[PDB]
Ligand binder design. Structure first.
Ligand SMILES: O=C(O)/C(O)=C/C(=O)c1cccc(O)c1Br
Ligand SMILES: [Mg+2]
Ligand SMILES: [Mg+2]
Ligand SMILES: [Mg+2]
Ligand SMILES: [Mg+2]
Length: 712
């Protein structure tokens, strides 16, 4: 079952995959590759373990500090000086500008949605890569952005009252984004190109654009184009003109659809949205990443570039696919896909850098044309780092991998998640540690909330999970991230990103509220579906992010004291029914997510909460819920009987929600026989003892336990 290379014992399925699938076409010699793996693992594992031990030592000191605190209001001056003494809060370096070069325009310049998808799901990954262009009509008709009120309800058949509202919404979008010199797109009867500029026919007169430079191109004949291509805030809009179509036949100008450039970049996720606990799982993911980079992943295939005629009459093309990042796992976990001679598992983050890096070489070379970075970069998101020494380690790991792969130094770029408190409070130093590799920072606010709870676990009971979004610490955290990014010269060089919209069915709400993120100067933010990407694209047409960033330059809007404000609840805060609701809600969301993780290896699941809101769950939202209940149990807000009773009460409700689903095995009534139930319980009752409250140690162990049982 294993292959010996030096000190390593490689699972045969991984050895075969790399030799037969990943290496051919890279001109890397297999024996040299595997010797490189052995040397990188041997050389870098000590520092990897040392960093993990440092996390544990720091947390132990903070725990003890809070237990020895007498004064009720935390003396913030004493707290801050303590974090400085133990090396948690480090000195801020002098101002600098990042030097990362060779980065694609989608990252340096284009503000727009960033889509995250589990790499183990080939169909979702394909749809994500293809989500660079998406139908606004479909996004509006298929979601609640257009209310299902007055005869506008969806049904088995196309509803023209609803379709007309879709059309009107899109016409107002055009008026607001590419305004006519006079009149409205709602009254357009036709489009032509005359002397290289767009002419819109109105019933009374004709008109051009208020800014004719927004006219980017067209398809078909200039006198009766089959489509018109507009650009606004660097994002493209395509009006499809087809009077013979069913929609276009009813349209006053024969418009069939409005196509939005949507998911500019996509993150193919190996981390919190997938369940991969052994070599077999990792190979499934690596193979999908390989198919994406070679261009031949198919279930349904990857799109080619798009051909246009320039306003002046020449030819040009536009990228048809989303520019792909890969999210590697972070520094914590090992995986038995490789073990050493003594049987120790190899760090999974090290493996991901080698193998996803190797596979990404295919995306730098011809498919027809090369799939991904035309400028020669490989884009890796590195999650869950704690402070600048951990960022420096990632950079050293990437350097060593580049040597093994024979790639130019600094080929492998890094998207830094700002999703751990020791990174937040040292963010300037963290960016500087990666100043020649960094291509984004992003506030992973869900992980950051989990780390907020775990770090101050001993200080007292935290506010309810739903209250966290309005706490001083998180508002400071979001502003601080933008400030540090802009201060490091990110405008025009690297993305400043914000976090995930999880309410998959509440697209009217997303359109209403997620505009806050580009208004806050973020040049990208996360969505979980191609449809959400198309709708979030609307916000970048309304908000001039480049303008917003220029206005924000130089501002210092968060103090260290605000960043360090612990989200403690006030005494007497909750009635029994409020406590009960928090416990039930958290138990339901935990059980709903964990049961499909452990029994079916699904790392991202839509789970209705106690208010029947469909939430896209992954490990970070699980980290919050389990840590909050662990915190409430730790400080006596709830008893161990309360937790067990809530889990038992919500488990059959999860069983019912899954009912069919044929691979689903119920948790109730024999709770002590359900590995999934016991994993959910363990995440709560052992939550305080998990490193930084991470969920992977328990999830991976319980999933492997489930697989072992299904094997015998
Ligand atoms: O805020 C973080 O810590 C972060 O990393 C976000 C996620 O990973 C996430 C959360 C929910 C659904 C989903 O698809 C994803 Br990708
Ligand atoms: Mg302890
Ligand atoms: Mg995260
Ligand atoms: Mg509260
Ligand atoms: Mg504008």
């Amino acid at each position: 079952d294993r292959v010996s290379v030096g000190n390593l014992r490689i699972a045969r399925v991984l050895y075969d995959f790399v030799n037969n699938e990943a290496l051919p076409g890279t001109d890397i010699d297999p024996d040299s590759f595997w010797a490189g793996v052995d040397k990188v693992v041997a050389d870098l594992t000590p520092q990897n373990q040392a960093l993990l031990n440092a996390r544990d030592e720091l947390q132990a000191q903070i725990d003890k500090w809070h237990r020895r605190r007498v004064i009720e209001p935390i003396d913030m001056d004493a707290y801050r000086q303590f974090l400085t003494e133990i090396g948690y809060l480090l000195p801020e370096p002098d101002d600098f500008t990042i030097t990362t070069s060779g980065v694609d325009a989608e990252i340096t310049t284009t503000a727009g949605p960033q889509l995250v998808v589990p790499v183990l799901n080939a169909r979702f990954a394909l749809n994500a890569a293809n989500a660079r262009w998406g139908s606004l009509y479909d996004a509006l008709y298929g979601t609640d952005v257009i209310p299902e009120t007055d005869g506008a309800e969806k049904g088995p058949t196309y509803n023209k009252v609803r379709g007309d509202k879709v059309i009107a919404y899109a016409r107002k979008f055009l008026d607001d984004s590419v305004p006519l010199s006079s009149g409205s797109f709602g009254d357009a009867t036709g489009f032509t190109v005359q002397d290289g500029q767009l002419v819109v026919a109105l019933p009374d007169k004709s008109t051009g654009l208020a800014n004719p430079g927004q006219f980017a191109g067209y398809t078909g004949a200039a006198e009766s184009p089959t489509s018109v291509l507009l650009i606004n805030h660097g994002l493209h809009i395509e009006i499809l003109i087809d009077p013979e179509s069913q929609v276009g036949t009813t349209d006053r100008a024969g418009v069939k659809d409005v196509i939005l450039e949507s998911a500019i970049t996509t993150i193919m996720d190996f981390e919190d949205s997938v369940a991969a606990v052994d070599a077999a799982d990792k190979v499934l993911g690596y193979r999908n990443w390989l198919g994406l980079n070679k261009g031949d992943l198919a279930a349904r295939v990857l799109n080619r570039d798009r051909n246009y005629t320039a306003p002046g009459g020449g030819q040009f093309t536009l990228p048809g696919r989303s520019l792909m990042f890969v999210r590697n796992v972070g520094h914590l976990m090992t995986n038995d896909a490789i073990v050493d001679t003594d049987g120790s598992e190899v760090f999974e983050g090290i493996m991901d850098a080698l193998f996803t890096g190797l596979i990404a070489i295919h995306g730098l070379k011809a498919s027809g044309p090369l799939i991904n970075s035309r400028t020669g970069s490989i884009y890796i998101v590195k999650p869950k780092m704690h402070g600048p020494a951990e960022v420096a380690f990632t950079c050293e790991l990437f350097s060593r991998v580049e040597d093994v792969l024979g790639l130019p130094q600094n080929t492998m770029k890094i998207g830094i998640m700002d999703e751990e408190r020791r990174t937040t409070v040292n963010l300037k130093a963290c960016i500087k540690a990666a100043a020649d590799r960094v291509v984004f920072i992003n506030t992973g606010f869900l992980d950051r909330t989990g780390d907020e709870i775990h770090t101050s676990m001993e200080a007292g009971p935290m506010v309810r999970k739903g209250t966290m979004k309005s706490q001083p610490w998180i508002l400071a955290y979001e502003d601080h991230n933008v400030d540090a990014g802009l201060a490091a010269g990110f405008s025009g060089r690297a993305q400043v990103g914000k976090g995930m919209w999880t309410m998959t069915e509440l697209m009217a709400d997303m359109v209403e509220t997620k505009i806050a993120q580009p208004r806050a100067g973020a040049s990208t933010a996360w969505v979980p579906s191609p449809t959400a990407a198309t709708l979030h694209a609307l916000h970048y047409h309304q908000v001039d992010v480049a303008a917003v960033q220029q206005g924000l330059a130089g501002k210092r809007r968060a103090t260290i004291e605000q960043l360090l404000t612990i989200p403690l609840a006030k005494e007497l805060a909750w009635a029994p029914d409020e406590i009960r609701e928090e416990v039930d809600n958290n138990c339901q969301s935990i059980l709903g997510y964990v049961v499909r993780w452990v029994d079916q290896g699904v790392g991202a699941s839509k789970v209705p909460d106690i208010h029947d809101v469909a939430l896209m769950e992954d490990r970070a939202t699980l980290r919050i819920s389990s840590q909050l209940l662990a915190n409430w149990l730790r400080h006596g807000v709830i008893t161990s009987a309360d937790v067990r009773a809530s889990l038992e009460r919500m488990a059959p409700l999860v069983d019912r929600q899954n009912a069919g689903d044929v691979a689903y095995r119920p948790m109730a009534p024999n709770f002590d026989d359900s590995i999934a139930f016991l994993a959910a319980q363990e995440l709560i009752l052992s939550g305080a003892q998990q490193p930084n409250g991470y969920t992977e140690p328990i999830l991976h162990r319980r999933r492997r336990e489930f697989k072992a049982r299904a094997a015998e």
